[model samples]
Target: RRRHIVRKRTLRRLLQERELVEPLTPSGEAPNQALLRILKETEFKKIKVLGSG
Candidate 1:
C-alpha cells in the first residue's frame, strides 16, 4: 500500500512535468544564424584545419 502510493505520486509528478515539457520543436533543431550573414566576411592571418574523425 505504501509503495503503491509512492508509485502513484511519482507517476503524477512525471505526468505534471510531461505536460509542461516541450516534446515537439517547430524546427526540431537548435538554430543559430550564420555569422557570415550578420558580421560579413573577414580575414585572419593564422588558421589550421584539423579533423578528429
Candidate 2:
C-alpha cells in the first residue's frame, strides 16, 4: 500500500515535470481512465513490462 502511494506520487511528479498536461481523452471527463490507459501503454515501453509474460 505504501509502495503504491509512493509510485502514484512519483508518477504525478514525473508527469508534472514533463508538462504532460493534456488529457489523453479529448473530452477530459474521464481523466482517470485516460491516465490509466496512458500508464498501461507507456509502462510497456518505459518499464519494459511485456504484455505477454
Clashes of 1: 0
Kindly report which residue stretches of model 2 are placed more than 4 angstroms away from their true locations once superposed.
1-29, 48-53
Q: What are the TM-scores, per candidate, against the unseen true structure?
A: 0.26, 0.30
Candidate with the greatest TM-score versus the true structure: 2
lDDT of 2 by residue, 10-40 (tens): 7776667554444453425577777788888
Model 1 segments more than 4 A misplaced: 1-5, 21-53
Clashing pairs in 1: none
Q: Residues 1-53, candidate 1: write the lDDT tens digits.
A: 64435786676756666545435422224223244433343222122222323
